[PDB]
Structures are given as structure tokens and as C-alpha cells.
Subunit: 250 residues, 4 copies
């Protein structure tokens, strides 16, 4: 029987590439999404056309709230309902916007940025572990630039740092259960689709390896390594996939 | 005019030592507390007996909620109300208890551990900056963040977020002359509930003296960071751990 | 045409595992060795029996000296002489023994430990780059460098310098399409001189399975980094330690 | 009795500021130098004018060689010969120049950069420890930008990384002897006198805190803290003094 994976925020970009590569590797996938219903459903449809009943969709807001634990439990439950198992969890879903220190209220900013990047990964990790030849692991999507953060992105940065702490803490604690916990950390490496080419060029020019952004597929490559049998001794590790960007001084 | 400092969770232990050393250095202090009302007022009394009108208390729950921003705004406001200025913020208050992955609901555990260790520090930093000499913030971090205690994920996540805040705020507040730094104890004043046998186990692990840090030793690093001897230092976290984080399993 | 790889200290243990896995992936290999001539030739024989003319041996002392640069240039040269190209360099060869601060002279200890772990990797990196597809260098680092073994200062300094080389060379060789990465074991194949009781002590420290890594497991991470699956990865060091570095004292 | 300190490369700049501040604090000082004989003697004169018999000079090349262990032993011995004790060692002396991967031979480059920045610190640490209410410590001058290195400075960077490892290893090992081992890490924060003012300004403009370099005094301030009784529980710590420079992404 085929293993199953949950990928949060899997409708687009890096999450989509991860879900696709897991599927191509033989995984059945839960495609979690928030707002991108059309994209998520069309992805699941494409994957199911490839192999019957190997993809399902699951909608959840991962903003922090008192119902977030239940939402995360339900995401994991959806994998068990659909496929009878859950082997891999990929914490990809993420809010990303500036929150300067000096329309959204600050409590909403906190809830979205810390919720998506840190608390939901924690609760999903809890639910994943509680519900557990096999090769069980979690991959957290981190950020290679966390020590050299984007100006005015404190809450985002705090969230990604907490995600590092979660990766380490969970690796330590879940090791007895055979659950490995690792991370993949892109740099400022695949720029937002809205951004102008000229603004994208400012970042690209800074990347030592090829003066270009990573493809979503290149990020997904590191995720599939970490979930694979080639990484069976690897836990608590975060792989930078940044083309040398974090090595470049101001 | 004397400068003024806010120290969160200042009624006992390390927070108390920080507040005392700041006061001894000439600062007027806001002693924030949560449940330790008697201890907090006792300390304020002692400091005011030393120099009149140089200490006030301020009660606030630092658990995450939709009113945490208001509570943090009020803590900073209380410093301006009492002393007309706020020069130093010390983010000391912290919940610390295990939250295994496998009586408190998980929602509550998240709110207390992430709230106290990370979100409140953020909101206090915001309010501090907004309300603005030698201005700085010191965050009480943790030297063992990369070698965490078993089953302390939420606490560890909070302290990691605190590192990210220290860096992010240092970067962003530098143009305003506000320095943001951290002090990271390994083992200092051990928990009150911890038995002497378990305390001795931890003490035995420390290379420098086989003993825990005094609260005063931790405070010493805090007062260096706030002092004029640290005027070019921002985004730095000073370990004060007697070599504990250097010891392999 | 098949790509070619240089693996230093490849006659046994992790170096052999790396050479073997590269060969199985389709690489022609230079098996560098120092004292293990019989093991190195035996390995080359086995690989050549599998595919004709795909393995050669190369002997060199990688102790620091004024001729180390020439020795390292010759190792790289031997790859070009044998295979007409050099696509991958694996810096595996390493001296490892205690050097307490309080038979070998200290100058010899410095020369061997810093030479093998740091200076030779640097000189090999220089010669590799100057002689220049999917080109990359993999440095064998150490996951425990921030939690070092007691009285292993020179070894530890060498491994830290190897981190700096990994970073510096990644930055500088990126314009040439040469990626530079590392693999950091915690405990893998334990020293042959180590008694089984001491080996079991180390094994028990490992959260993931209470066991050391096989050489193959280390080699797996090396082959990932050299592969097309790692084409955007440079300046990264992958821990392969089963969580060892996460465990506090 | 006054405590005594060895400061390597103390004739100029940061080393000089350190020597001066230690002296002002009540230390007797050994002023080590390499080529700056006039500056070293002039400093010794100035300090002895202040308090008689509190400063001596010691010349040594700290380039790696088979005679380096003896040279380092003699530097420490000079403190004991002059002052009868040695309480503090400051590893400040440092070669700093580019060594591209693609007049000096590479073996000389290796000897100078790795010798001054790492091997000599190690040998001096050995001799210091062997020769031992007291407050013994070593302060190593590190570099805040070691993870974001200057282009083509690989040997320098390797040296500074090795200095980090020495700081940690020696802290662990010398703790039982009451010898603390710490570091102070400036950024690109006090620029080379040979650098043109226009290039200096490019670097100054990068520093978030004040858009300016650190004074040598400010670096010395951190050294003074670490040697003081206010740092009695601090060992294996490296204090960045970089005005936020290392926090700034490319
Ligand atoms: N792109 C980069 O260069 C880069 C750099 C560093 C780190 N990373 C990390 O890598 C991961 C993937 O990056 P990306 O750029 O592909 O991400 P992205 O497109 O910006 O967002 C990924 C998904 O997160 C989901 N999301 C946002 N808010 C949510 C919420 N409140 N509840 C549930 N889901 C929510 C969104 O789902 P819907 O579309 O369905 O609404 C979105 O599609 C992220 O964790 C990111 O932080 C990326
Ligand atoms: N002690 C150590 O060995 C050690 C080690 C590493 C890091 N640290 C860090 O150093 C700092 C001080 O340590 P410590 O041992 O002195 O701390 P602590 O005694 O455990 O706690 C300090 C104060 O935090 C306040 N606090 C707890 N929950 C709160 C809440 N929900 N809202 C508002 N305040 C709350 C408490 O105030 P009330 O009593 O008034 O209720 C308490 O007095 C902490 O940030 C800690 O994480 C300490
Ligand atoms: N084993 C572990 O648990 C572990 C843990 C952390 C890191 N690592 C790293 O992973 C790598 C492989 O480990 P390992 O245990 O397989 O290594 P190893 O057996 O201790 O040494 C590998 C080879 O290094 C060569 N070597 C030693 N001194 C040399 C010199 N002066 N000149 C030239 N070659 C010299 C030897 O070649 P000859 O036999 O031909 O003389 C030896 O076979 C090393 O870099 C190591 O530091 C290993
Ligand atoms: N300047 C900065 O912004 C900065 C940044 C990061 C780190 N640091 C670190 O801070 C420390 C002081 O910096 P700095 O700029 O003041 O240093 P510096 O002026 O470049 O050099 C300090 C001294 O090192 C000595 N030296 C050089 N080569 C030597 C050799 N082969 N043998 C013995 N001594 C030798 C020289 O002594 P003589 O003059 O007597 O010949 C020189 O005066 C250094 O360790 C440096 O790496 C500085
Ligand atoms: N560029 C960029 C992004 C970074 Br840095 N972190 C991110 N996180 C999310 N979720 N999306 C993004 O586009 C990015
Ligand atoms: N021992 C201990 C403590 C650590 Br580690 N982190 C802590 N945080 C708080 N707040 N209190 C404590 O006693 C401790
Ligand atoms: N055990 C072990 C070893 C470590 Br840790 N680093 C090493 N380096 C080499 N070269 N050999 C070894 O056996 C080990
Ligand atoms: N700017 C600058 C310098 C750095 Br970064 N590291 C250095 N090291 C030495 N020795 N001298 C210098 O001027 C500098």
C-alpha cells in the first residue's frame, strides 16, 4: 500500500511542487489550502487523473485561534479518512507580509503570522504524532535568511524562528517513535508573483549561484530527499536551498 | 533627570535582581508582575525607601489574547505616567513548563508559553518604540535553545521567536537609536518546585564551578548591555551559562 | 563520458563508502590514501572489476607543510591524468586525536590536525577550481563542533575552519558553477581503538535509534549534495547525526 | 598586587585601545607587537609615565612555523618575568588580506593567516594555562561577519572560524582551572587605514546603528566587561559589537 502525505498550503507555488513530487514518488496526498479553492481542486483533479483516488483536498484557516487545535486535528484526520494512514507532514502554508514596529489589527497580524508559521505546525505535529518498514517524517518550510531578516518583518521572522525551535524540539521528542523532523530553508529565493521584474532583479543579482531564484521544484527536491530512505538517520536538520544568498554580506 | 526602566516579571528571582541593579545604577523602575503582588509591592517599598518616588508596580497578564496589545501598551504607559519617560525595557517575564507532543488545554498552553516568551515581548517592543539618551531593550533568552529540555516544545518555540525578535527589532529600531539585545542564561535560579536531587544533577553539568548562576550574575550582563559601555552593541545575545551549552550529551 | 570524483582518505570507513556510492552512481574515482595502501588498492581492484578503468589510487600525506600545496595540486592532477576531468571533490581525510591544553610535538599535532581537516581541503579546493556539467565539493564536517569532545581543541579548530572554508568557497566559486557543501556526522563508524563499552556509551546518546550511523548513511547525504537534486544548494552543511547534537548535557 | 595582562598586536588600533583600557582598570600590561616597534615602545612609555613599571614590550612574529610554540611560550613568559603573574590573555594580533582561490606564496598566506588568527591563539592559550580571589580569563578577537565573509578572504575566514572553535574548546577544558575563555566579535566595524575614504563610507552606510564604524574604545569596552568580575559566570561566549551589521541581508 502507498504511503500518504499532508502538504499544507499546497494549491500553488512551492507547496504545489512538493505535493506533485510526493505524488510522482508514489505518495497519496492531502492538498490543504485556505483561499485557493479552484487551484487546489484542479491540482487534486490532475493527480487523480494520473492515479485514481490518490489526492484529496482539505480547507482550513491556520490563523491562530482557540479553534486552531481542532482545525489541525481535522487536517490530519482527513489523511486517515482518505488513505487510512499518514506518513509525511509538510508544514508549508505561511502568511508573509510586513508588520512594522513603528487595515489589519496587530492581534490579527500576530494570529496570522505566528499561527501559520509556528503554532499550526506545532498543532499539526501534535496531531500527526498522536495518530501514529514505515518511514515517518515531518518537513518544515523554514527560511535561510532568518538571521538576516527582511526589514519590518518581525512577526514573520519570529514565526520562522519558532519553526526552527519546533523542528529541533520535535526531532528530539519524536525520535523514540521513529518520526524524523527536518526543515528545508529557501532564501529570498522564489519571489512573490505580484512583484515587478525589476524588483525581482534586485534580489536575483544578489544570488551567488546563477543570479537567479530557485524553482519551486528545486525546493521540493530537498523535501523529497528528507522524506526518502536516503535520509533515514537525518533528524533535526535544516537544509538551506538558497544558492548562497545567506552567505552574502550587506 | 533619572532614566526609567520597565522590567517584566520583576517581583522575584532574576527579574527582581535586574530591577534592583537598575535601581542601584540610578534608574527609576516599573516592577511588572502577574500573581506575585506581595513580592512586587515589597520590592517597590524597599526601593522607594532607598530613593523616594523611584519605583512603581504594574500588574498584567502576559498570556496571548486579543487584549494583550492593550495590556502591553498599558505597561509602557505606566512608565510614562510615573516617570515621564521610558529608557529601558527588560523582557523577563516567562511561563516555563512542559508541553508534551504525545489540566490546561493546548490553546491555553500555546497562549501562555508563546504569549509570555515572544508575543508580549513583541508588543512591548512596539509600544516602547512608538512612545519614543541611551535607549535599549534587553530580552531574557535561553542559552540551551538548540539543545532543548525534553517535552518543552512551546517554551522552546517561544524562546526561539524571542531570538528572531531581538534580531528583527535591532535591525528596525537602530535608526531610532534603540538598541535591542539579549541575555541567555543556561541554568540560573532553578525552579522552586524542583527537588534538591534534580537541582544537583543540573549543577553537576556546569563546567565553570559546577553551580548555577546567581540572579545577580544574570543581572550583571543586563546592566552591561543597557550601559554606555555597550553603545555599539545591538542584535547581540550574551550567553551567561558557565559553559553549560558547550557540553555534549 | 562519465564524470570523475576525488575522495580523500577513501581506503576505508566513510571515505570508502563515499567512493563506492559515487562509483555505483557512475563516477570514475580517485581513491586517495595515506598509510592504507593495501586497503586502497583492494578497493580500486574491486571497482575496476565492476567497470574497467574507473578507479585509480593516489597516495599523499595531508599534514601541513610548505609542500602541502604541491601535494594537493598533484591529487587533483591525478584525476585529470586518469580521467581527463574532475567533477567532484570530497574532503574526507582527517586526523582525529586528543590534544590537551595542559610522543608527538605540538607543532606536529598542529600540522596534522589543522592540515588534514582544514588546510588540505583549502588547497585541494584551490587546485580543483583552478583546473576548471555539475561541479561540486563536499566537505566532511562534524555536527558536534559547538559541543566539542573534551581536549580535542586542534581537531575542533580544524573542523570549524572547514565550516568557514565551505562558506567562503561557496560564495567565491558560485560564479564558476562550483557548489560547495558539507555533510556533518555526529557519530558514525566509531574509532577502531575504542572499546565496545565506550562505543555503547555514545550509541545510547543518539535519540534516533540509539545507534551510530552506517558509513552508507553518511554517503547518502554526500551523493544527494553532488546530485542534480541539489543544483541550487551551496554553502549548506547537512547534519547526519540522528539528533545527537540536540541532546543537552 | 596588580593583575597582569598580555595583549597581542597591541601597538595600534583595537589592540592599543584594549591595552590602554586594561591599564586604566589597574592592569600591568605586556604590549606584544610584530613590526610596530616605535608605536609599541611609545605606548609602553605613555603607560609607565602614568604608573611606574606597569608596561613592557615583547616582539614576536606569530606566523605559523615550527618555532611558533616557543615564541608563544616566551610571550607568556615575558609577563611572568616582568610582573610575576599573568591573569588575562587577549588574542588580538591578526593578519588580514585577500587570498583568492583562483608576491606571497600560498604556504606563506596559510602560515600568516591561520598562524596569527588561530594557531598562535591556541599556543598562547596552552602556555597561559600551563603557567597557572583571582580572575583568570582569555578574550579572543573574533569576527561578527564570519558566516557572511568578505569575498576572496577564505584563509582569514577559516582562521576566525577556528578561533571560534578554540574559544569553545578552551572554555570547556579550562573551566575546571577557573580560566574563562570568551570572544569579542567586531563587524566590518573598524576599517583598514589603507582603505580609501570613499570605500570606508560604503561600509559605514551599511551599519544600522548610526551608519558608522565602531571606535577601538567601544570594542575594548566589551573586552573589559568579559575580563571583569561582572562576567564571572561567562565562559564560551562571543559578544558581537557590530552595530547590527551582521543582521543586514545582501
Ligand atoms: N518563496 C520564498 O522565496 C521563500 C523564502 C523563504 C521561506 N519560504 C517558505 O517556503 C514556504 C512556501 O513558500 P511560498 O512562497 O510558496 O508560499 P506562499 O505562496 O506565499 O504561501 C503558501 C500558502 O500558504 C497558505 N496560507 C497563507 N495564509 C494561510 C492561512 N491563514 N491559513 C492556511 N493557509 C494559509 C496560502 O494558501 P491559499 O493560497 O490556499 O490561500 C498559500 O498558498 C513558506 O512556508 C515560506 O515561508 C519561501
Ligand atoms: N532560571 C533559569 O535557570 C533560566 C534559564 C534560562 C532562561 N531563563 C530566562 O530568564 C528569565 C527569568 O528567569 P526566572 O527563573 O527568574 O523566571 P521565573 O521565575 O520562572 O518567571 C519570572 C516571572 O515571570 C512571570 N510570569 C509567568 N507567567 C506570566 C504571565 N502569564 N503573565 C505575566 N507574567 C508572567 C511571573 O510573574 P509573577 O510571579 O508575578 O506571577 C514570574 O515571577 C525568564 O525569561 C527565563 O525564561 C531563566
Ligand atoms: N567517524 C565518525 O563518527 C565521524 C564523526 C564526525 C565527523 N566525521 C568526519 O567524517 C570523515 C570520515 O570519518 P572516518 O571516521 O571514516 O575517518 P578516519 O577513518 O578517522 O580517517 C579517514 C582517513 O583519513 C586519512 N588521514 C589521516 N591522516 C592523514 C594525513 N596526515 N594525510 C592524509 N590522509 C590522512 C587516513 O588515510 P589512511 O588510512 O590511508 O592513512 C584515513 O583512512 C572525517 O572527516 C571525519 O572527521 C566522522
Ligand atoms: N578592524 C575591524 O573592523 C575588525 C573587524 C572584525 C574583526 N576584527 C578583529 O579585531 C582584532 C583587531 O583588529 P585591528 O583592525 O585592530 O587589527 P590590525 O590593525 O589589522 O592588526 C593588529 C595587529 O596584528 C599584528 N600582526 C599582523 N600580522 C602579524 C604577525 N604575522 N605576527 C604577529 N603580529 C601580527 C600587527 O602588529 P604590528 O603592527 O606590530 O606589526 C597589527 O598591529 C583582529 O583580531 C581582527 O581580526 C577587527
Ligand atoms: N520572497 C519571499 C518570501 C519569503 Br523570504 N518568505 C516567504 N513566505 C511566504 N509564505 N511567501 C513568500 O513569497 C515568501
Ligand atoms: N531552570 C530553568 C528555567 C529555564 Br532552562 N527556562 C526558564 N524560564 C523560566 N521562566 N523560569 C525558569 O525557572 C526557567
Ligand atoms: N568517533 C569519531 C570521530 C569524530 Br566525532 N570525528 C572523527 N574524525 C575522524 N577522522 N575519525 C573518527 O573516527 C572521528
Ligand atoms: N575592516 C576590517 C577588518 C576585518 Br572584517 N577583519 C580584520 N582583521 C584585521 N586584523 N584587521 C582589520 O582591519 C580587519
Amino acid at each position: 500500500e502507498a504511503p500518504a502525505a499532508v502538504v499544507t498550503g499546497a494549491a500553488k507555488r512551492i507547496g504545489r511542487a512538493i505535493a506533485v513530487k510526493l505524488h510522482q514518488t508514489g505518495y497519496r496526498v492531502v492538498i490543504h489550502y485556505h483561499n485557493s479553492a479552484e487551484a487546489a481542486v484542479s491540482l487534486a483533479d490532475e493527480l487523480n487523473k494520473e492515479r485514481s483516488n490518490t489526492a484529496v483536498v482539505c480547507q482550513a484557516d491556520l490563523t491562530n485561534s482557540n479553534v486552531l487545535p481542532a482545525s489541525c486535528e481535522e487536517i490530519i484526520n482527513s489523511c486517515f479518512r482518505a488513505f487510512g494512514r499518514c506518513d509525511v507532514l509538510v508544514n508549508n502554508a505561511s502568511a508573509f507580509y510586513p508588520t512594522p514596529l513603528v487595515g489589519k489589527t496587530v492581534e490579527t497580524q500576530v494570529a496570522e503570522l505566528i499561527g501559520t508559521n509556528a503554532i499550526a505546525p506545532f498543532l499539526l505535529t501534535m496531531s500527526f504524532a498522536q495518530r501514529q518498514s514505515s518511514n515517518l517524517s515531518i518537513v518544515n518550510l523554514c527560511d535561510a535568511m532568518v538571521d538576516q531578516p527582511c526589514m519590518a518583518f518581525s512577526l514573520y521572522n519570529m514565526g520562522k524562528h519558532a519553526l526552527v525551535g519546533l523542528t529541533q524540539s520535535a526531532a528530539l521528542e519524536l525520535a523514540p517513535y521513529g518520526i524524523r523532523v527536518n526543515g528545508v530553508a529557501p532564501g529570498v529565493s522564489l519571489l512573490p508573483v505580484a512583484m515587478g521584474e525589476e524588483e525581482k532583479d534586485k534580489w536575483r543579482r544578489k544570488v551567488p549561484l546563477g543570479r537567479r531564484e530557485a524553482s519551486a521544484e528545486q525546493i521540493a527536491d530537498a523535501v523529497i530527499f528528507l522524506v526518502s530512505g536516503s535520509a533515514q538517520y537525518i533528524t533535526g536538520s535544516i537544509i538551506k536551498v538558497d544558492g548562497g544568498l545567506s552567505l552574502v554580506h550587506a
